[PDB]
Design an enzyme around this catalytic site. Sequence first.
Site, mmCIF file in Angstrom:
data_model
loop_
_atom_site.group_PDB
_atom_site.id
_atom_site.type_symbol
_atom_site.label_atom_id
_atom_site.label_comp_id
_atom_site.label_asym_id
_atom_site.label_seq_id
_atom_site.Cartn_x
_atom_site.Cartn_y
_atom_site.Cartn_z
ATOM 1 N N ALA A 37 0.825 -1.202 0.000
ATOM 2 C CA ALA A 37 0.000 0.000 0.000
ATOM 3 C C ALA A 37 0.862 1.257 0.000
ATOM 4 O O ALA A 37 1.918 1.298 0.632
ATOM 5 C CB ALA A 37 -0.935 -0.001 1.200
ATOM 6 N N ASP A 38 0.406 2.281 -0.712
ATOM 7 C CA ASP A 38 1.137 3.541 -0.794
ATOM 8 C C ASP A 38 1.271 4.182 0.584
ATOM 9 O O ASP A 38 0.695 3.703 1.560
ATOM 10 C CB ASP A 38 0.430 4.503 -1.751
ATOM 11 C CG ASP A 38 1.165 4.656 -3.067
ATOM 12 O OD1 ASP A 38 1.036 3.758 -3.926
ATOM 13 O OD2 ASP A 38 1.871 5.672 -3.240
ATOM 14 N N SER A 39 2.038 5.266 0.654
ATOM 15 C CA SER A 39 2.253 5.969 1.914
ATOM 16 C C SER A 39 1.077 6.886 2.231
ATOM 17 O O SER A 39 0.537 6.860 3.338
ATOM 18 C CB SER A 39 3.547 6.783 1.852
ATOM 19 O OG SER A 39 4.447 6.241 0.902
#
Length: 79
Positions: A37-39
Site C-alpha cells: 500500500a502507498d504511503s
Amino acid sequence: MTREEVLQKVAKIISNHFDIEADQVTDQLNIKDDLNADSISVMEFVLELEDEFGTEISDEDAEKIETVGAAVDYIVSNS
C-alpha cells in the site's frame, strides 16, 4: 470499541480496500508491505481507525501500526 469489533472492521476495510484475504490477514502479514500500500493511503487508514474506534494515533507509531496485529494491538491496548 472492543478488540473484536475493531479487529473485524479493520480486517474488513482492509480486505475490501486491498486484494488481501480477510481470512489470511494475520499479524505476521503486514498489509503495508504485503499489499505494498502507498504511503499517502496510510494517512487515510490511520484516520478512519482513529475516528471509528475513536483513538489518537501518534505520527511515529502510525508507521509501525500498519499490520493486522500491529493495528488491533494498538487500538485495543490504547482503548
